[PDB]
Design a protein around this ligand. Structure first.
Ligand code: 8Q1
Ligand code: SF4
Ligand code: SF4
Lengths: 135, 199, 90, 216, 386, 84, 119, 45
């Protein structure tokens, strides 16, 4: 991207860029580290235990947390985690905190309580080029 | 320049923050602190003695001795193109017969509902209009009528200076439209001789 | 530094109604001049919607979902931005 | 907050392969499996985001709309932080004549979604102000244009019609030009609404051919 | 449920078309309640009684500062449900003229913001280039503002010969005009002190407040629809994205200027890559044929008769499409029943969303900054009130 | 008890006297708003407004809802401490 | 104790509470008193005395809240009061006991070929 | 086999019209007209 100021900014030092994009001011003054993300993921995994084991929502959240933890384990440099996850560590910290906070309301409402013969009508859209262009 | 300074912030939260926290120093977009007598004198020359107003002043003053783009209407006019959509008009054939054949495509296409058409067969068997009215106070000059007509009957002429003192004068009938077409035919035909390569 | 308001003949030398060269604007595809069949190219009236089966007793293995995701700085693949929208030869 | 400027270089790419493939083929199935109670009907549509993909559309009761929106904004896989707009459609043929529409944008993964709830004139719709600030004026405009009520709103009042205007102009039964017209009277020195009158009445044209098959 | 009791402070900010009611405990604003609808023309209901081609000029007068962008979203929404591919040359022309329109919108916005602040010279100076681009528009569509140029499947007419020459000639000095424009405000302490740290907005609030366009970019947010969800030939175009991180009026000013720079770059790239070929989609059953073709062929005459009276019948369905408008993200929701008129056409305007931020942003500010808030918001009530 | 049981009664009768929907002789020192007078809830609200206006007080809606008789109003006024 | 909890009487009581401020702010001291203003508001209520859904009554009350609130912030100028409040009262008390002895059907016949519509 | 114009969005309009709870709504005579807010004489014709 392009910096707006008339001055030259290196931007190769990651903290300088973090200052420029105002993460320090608007999102997190504190620099996010791998350990904080690990703590957040562990908290989410602890928090999701309020859901029944038979719920697929718990299953999906657990799978996401397991993948994120594997990413954190196999990666040492935080910039590597940024490259893998296409964001910054502070963003991931906010994501994990948000996902943990989502749990109590879902537990209080429990969307999984549906009859065994619950029916979901599904409609799919098919393009005309499917039968018109070269197979 | 685009750099920022302490005290030049236009707020209170930010001003109170910078005079009681060095957070602006961590920001690279803020001009860094002077470190010697030379840099202090440079900063003083920046703040005092203006030196920022002076440049814009000089540029405006050069603009004073500069040329202008002003035109002397009505003795001078602007630049326009044949595609210009102006006053609607009715066209004829060179023998003198009306081009409009009351196919009512123009009325059908007009989203302004500003066209009122009545027609019947003429005494010679010709299919001609009996009432052809377009409300200029209601016409939006979109030119969609000029696009729809397949005989080049209705055209938006190059006339654009046709303001009237009363609103009633703009209730264009068949007769005034034909008058306008007979007046402006040559210019419209010349423009069509160009627009034909695109239309 | 460039000056506004160029002098005569440096800008808009010719009026639009007096182009020095005749204009040849195509108005049909040379492929479709004599082969005018339309059913092979009626995309509009051939789109379809289908009501799929009741998606209730399905098995969504998130394992397969997360097995296809990268784990390192390398091995990361990104879908390129398409240059243009489809034109179908025109 | 997301979509922060991370790379200093130009990007020739849009999203990642796995995430795009999921969001374009199994996103709807993921939504169905996660919260089937929140799911009532599923349509994957013309992909608001781009002409070359597929995107889903959600139908549900007004009861669970708020938790569904909460999950859709807050889920780690569905970070729909941008609610574009809230509007409605009139279906006078149906028992419930209103189809309220909810649109979301996910800058985290360059995606979008549509959420719809079908209600009648006398059923409340819980407000989404607590979930999105922008819903305030959208709910206001929807109420002004259709009379769709939103329970728990801070202050639900007309925003686009006249001050003393009664009625919802975007209703299908609402006349195109209406009932009242306004003019100034010299005698009373006041600008007053009067029964609508037209020098030339509107002309409606029936072009719909008796042969078209696409009519629905 | 609520009485009046304490009258105390009372204010009325302007019947003349924004009506503003504010609340101050003195010199500092605590509440600000805009009232709108003085320009609500009820177009959306009016759209239902018009054909798709008939209703097209409605989109000219939604944002009369930026027109072709408004046309483009509706046209794309029609075409996607119509499953129609746009020719390459038409896409080039659309993108180039859209960049010119974006330049006009940025110019007029910045000049009006300056005049509200107190600078009058850039207003007059930039309106000369604005007149130049109006001449460009008139040459290609015969209308200065309400061109109605964009069409379903392409454009109404091809570019007249000799237009790109003057386009390049204008671009050869537009950079100098922009440079002389900047020196009047860029290096000024007064302009900054008026604009710096006024109306600060966060990324979290902005995504909560549904921001789009340059305001989003000034919060450290990497987002352009032309790079994330590209349409037409924008994917081929190579250009930069200005990025700021304060959410400041000065920051938005600089962001808009750099956006103008990038628009000029895209204009150059389009100028040097103009292809030769068809400008309208070859489907005569949707696109009108040539007048020469109409006057010598029965089939084209029949299609001209039918389309110009009844028009093409969009298949029943629904879609929403948005375009990276100069004022933000301009989107239109299209509901199709199967006929020749759109059943329900909802219009989304970015300025309407931005205008909703006044109360929270104007808090803690001063009456000298409300005008600053409105000017930097870059709002046209035509799109705000439809 | 905050006021006299008589003067309040004559003031109530006088403020009742100036209603167009009522019969001047049908009004009794003790009556019923519904059965005797044939007046609805809104008329009772208007009655409460007139009484409060003469007596310079304020009555919340619930107390007015509890009020349905002339004696009700008289005893309510006499029980009001802000009485004048 | 009352139909649908009697929300209608509570709404009328609230509007009557808010009424005198409207009279003072809009200079109706020299046209009306509190009593006949209250009578006007009462007659406004009688338009829907036969509604059988509590929900419809709630929405009616909410729209009436909006009308009275836009009355409160003076958003409707004096001309609105002229055209809806005091001149209708003057007409109602003015054309009392008209001297026309013809039936309404015959009145319509002598009026026009169609019945009158609108106000 | 079921085939009644089974290649269009109309099926998506067939459903969402039979949604449970949404398909049991009912209103009394003249009740919806009260919600209209139009002049009362509209119903006299
Ligand atoms: C400046 C003033 C502005 C005014 C604007 C607001 C105007 C609002 C007017 C419309 C409000 C309503 O009708 S509210 C709708 C009221 N209707 C219902 O609730 C259904 C049952 N009918 C009743 O309750 C009646 O009041 C009744 C039969 C008399 C019961 O007799 P009582 O009463 O003994 O109880
Ligand atoms: S002006 Fe042209 S389009 Fe209109 S009725 Fe006459 S011939 Fe037909
Ligand atoms: S130019 Fe447009 S508004 Fe004017 S008559 Fe022709 S179609 Fe109608």
């Amino acid at each position: 991207f392009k910096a707006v100021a008339d001055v030259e900014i290196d931007f190769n030092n990651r903290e300088v860029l973090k200052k420029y994009v105002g993460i320090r001011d608007h999102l997190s003054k504190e620099p996010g580290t791998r350990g904080k993300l690990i703590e957040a993921l562990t908290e989410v995994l602890s928090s999701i235990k309020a859901a029944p084991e038979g719920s697929d929502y718990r299953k999906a959240v657990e799978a996401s947390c397991i993948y994120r933890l594997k990413v954190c384990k196999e990666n040492e440099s935080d910039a590597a985690i940024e490259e893998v996850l296409d964001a910054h560590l502070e963003e991931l910290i906010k994501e994990a905190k948000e996902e943990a906070r989502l749990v109590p309301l879902i537990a209080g409402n429990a969307p999984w309580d549906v009859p065994a013969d619950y029916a979901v009508p599904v409609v799919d859209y098919t393009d005309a080029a499917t039968i018109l262009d070269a197979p | 320049g685009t750099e920022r300074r302490p005290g030049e912030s236009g707020a209170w939260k930010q001003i109170e923050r910078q005079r009681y926290a060095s957070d602006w120093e961590n920001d690279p977009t803020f001009k860094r602190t002077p470190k010697n007598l030379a840099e202090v004198l440079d900063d003083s020359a920046s703040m005092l003695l203006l030196t920022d107003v002076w440049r814009g002043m000089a540029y405006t003053l050069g603009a004073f001795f500069d040329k202008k783009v002003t035109i002397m209407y009505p003795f001078e006019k602007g630049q326009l193109s044949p595609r210009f959509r102006g006053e609607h008009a009715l066209r004829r054939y060179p023998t003198g017969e009306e081009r409009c054949i009351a196919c009512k495509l123009c009325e059908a296409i007009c989203p302004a509902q500003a066209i009122t058409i009545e027609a019947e067969e003429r005494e010679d068997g010709s299919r001609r209009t009996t009432r052809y009215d377009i409300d200029m106070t209601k016409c939006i000059y979109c030119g969609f009528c000029q696009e729809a007509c397949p005989v080049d009957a209705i055209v938006e002429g190059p006339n654009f200076e046709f303001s009237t003192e009363t609103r009633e004068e703009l209730l264009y009938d068949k007769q005034k439209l034909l008058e306008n077409g007979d007046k402006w035919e040559t210019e419209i035909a010349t423009n069509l001789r160009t627009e034909s390569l695109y239309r | 530094f460039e000056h506004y308001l160029p002098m005569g003949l440096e800008y808009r030398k010719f009026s639009p109604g007096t182009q020095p060269v005749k204009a040849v604007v195509p108005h049909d595809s040379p492929k479709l001049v004599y082969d005018i069949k339309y059913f092979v190219r009626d995309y509009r009236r051939n789109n379809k919607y289908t009501a799929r089966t009741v998606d209730a007793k399905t098995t969504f293995d998130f394992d397969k979902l997360y097995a296809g995701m990268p784990t390192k700085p390398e091995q990361v693949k990104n879908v390129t931005r398409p240059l243009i929208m489809p034109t179908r030869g025109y | 907050g997301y979509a922060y400027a991370r790379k200093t270089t130009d990007k020739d790419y849009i999203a990642s392969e796995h995430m795009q493939a999921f969001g374009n083929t199994q996103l709807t199935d993921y939504i169905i499996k996660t919260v089937p109670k929140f799911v009532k009907m599923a349509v994957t549509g013309p992909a608001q985001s781009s002409v070359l993909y597929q995107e889903p559309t959600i139908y549900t009761t007004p009861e669970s709309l708020v938790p569904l929106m909460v999950f859709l904004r807050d889920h780690t896989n569905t970070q729909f932080k941008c609610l574009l707009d809230v509007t409605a459609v009139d279906f006078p043929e149906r028992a419930a004549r209103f189809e309220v529409v909810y649109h979301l944008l996910s800058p985290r993964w360059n995606n979008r979604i549509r959420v719809k709830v079908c209600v009648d004139e006398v059923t409340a719709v819980p407000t989404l102000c607590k979930v999105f600030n922008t819903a305030n004026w959208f709910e206001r405009e929807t109420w002004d244009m259709f009379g769709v009520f939103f329970s728990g709103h801070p202050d639900l009042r007309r925003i686009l019609t006249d001050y003393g205007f009664t009625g919802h102009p975007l209703r299908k039964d609402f006349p195109m030009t209406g009932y009242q017209e306004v003019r100034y009277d010299y005698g009373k020195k006041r600008v007053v609404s009067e029964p609508l009158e037209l020098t030339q009445e509107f002309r409606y044209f029936d072009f719909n051919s008796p042969w078209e098959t696409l009519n629905r | 449920l609520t009485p009046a009791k304490v009258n105390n402070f009372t204010l009325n900010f302007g019947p003349q078309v924004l009506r503003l009611v504010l609340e101050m405990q003195g010199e500092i604003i605590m509440r600000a309640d805009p009232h709108i609808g003085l320009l609500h023309r009820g177009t959306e209901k009016l759209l239902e009684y018009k054909t798709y081609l008939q209703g097209l000029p409605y989109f000219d007068r939604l944002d009369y500062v930026s027109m072709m962008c408004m046309e483009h979203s509706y046209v794309l929404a029609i075409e996607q449900l119509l499953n129609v591919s746009v020719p390459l040359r038409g896409q080039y022309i659309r993108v180039l003229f859209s960049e010119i329109t974006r330049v006009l919108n940025h110019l007029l916005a910045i000049t009006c913001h300056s005049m509200d602040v107190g600078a009058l010279t850039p207003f007059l100076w930039a309106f000369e280039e604005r007149e130049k681009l109006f001449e460009f528009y008139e040459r290609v569509s015969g209308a200065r503002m309400h061109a109605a140029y964009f069409r379903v499947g392409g454009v109404s007419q091809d570019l007249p010969i000799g237009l790109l020459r003057d386009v390049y000639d204008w671009a050869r000095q537009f950079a100098s005009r922009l440079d002389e424009m900047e020196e009047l405000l860029t290096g000024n302490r007064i302009w900054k002190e008026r604009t710096v740290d006024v109306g600060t907005i966060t990324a979290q609030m902005a995504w909560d407040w549904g921001c789009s366009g340059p305001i989003l970019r000034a919060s450290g947010i990497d987002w352009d629809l032309r790079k994330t969800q590209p349409y037409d030939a924008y994917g081929k175009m190579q250009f930069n994205v200005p990025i700021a991180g304060h959410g400041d009026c000065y920051d938005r000013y600089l962001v808009r200027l750099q956006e103008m720079r990038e628009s000029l770059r895209i204009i150059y790239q389009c100028l040097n890559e103009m292809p030769d070929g068809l400008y309208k989609s070859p489907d005569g059953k949707v696109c009108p044929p040539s007048r020469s073709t109409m006057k010598q062929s029965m089939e084209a005459l029949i299609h001209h008769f039918k389309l110009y009276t009844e028009g093409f019948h969009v298949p029943a369905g629904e879609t929403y499409r948005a375009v990276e408008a100069p004022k933000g993200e301009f989107g239109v929701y299209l509901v199709s029943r199967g006929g020749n008129r759109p059943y329900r056409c909802k219009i989304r305007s970015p300025g309407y969303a931005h205008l909703q931020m006044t109360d929270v942003i104007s808090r803690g500010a001063m009456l000298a900054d409300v005008v600053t808030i409105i000017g930097t918001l870059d709002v046209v009530f035509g799109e705000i009130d439809r | 008890g905050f006021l006299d049981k008589d003067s309040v009664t004559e003031r109530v009768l006088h403020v009742t006297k100036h209603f167009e929907k009522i019969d001047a002789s049908k009004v009794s020192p003790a009556a019923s708003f519904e059965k005797d007078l044939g007046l609805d809830s809104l008329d009772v609200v208007e009655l409460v407004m007139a009484l409060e206006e003469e007596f310079g007080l304020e009555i919340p809606d619930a107390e007015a809802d509890k009020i349905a008789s002339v004696g009700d109003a008289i005893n309510y006024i006499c029980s009001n401490p802000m009485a004048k | 104790k009352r139909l649908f909890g009697g929300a209608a009487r509570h709404f009328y009581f609230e509007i009557c509470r808010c009424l005198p401020f409207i009279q003072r702010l809009h200079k109706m001291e020299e046209m009306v008193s509190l009593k006949e203003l209250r009578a006007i508001v009462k007659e406004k209520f009688k338009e829907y005395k036969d509604v059988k859904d509590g929900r419809v009554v709630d929405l009616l009350i909410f729209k009436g809240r909006e009308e009275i609130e836009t009355y409160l912030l003076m958003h409707k100028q004096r001309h609105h009061v002229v055209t809806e409040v005091v001149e209708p009262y003057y007409a109602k008390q003015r054309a009392v006991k008209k001297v026309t002895t013809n039936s309404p059907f015959l009145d319509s016949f002598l009026s026009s070929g169609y019945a009158a519509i609108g106000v | 086999e079921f085939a009644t114009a089974s290649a269009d969005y109309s099926i998506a309009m067939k459903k969402a019209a039979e949604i449970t709870g949404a398909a049991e709504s009912a209103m009394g005579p003249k009740e919806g007209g009260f919600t209209a807010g139009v002049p009362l004489d509209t119903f006299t014709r």
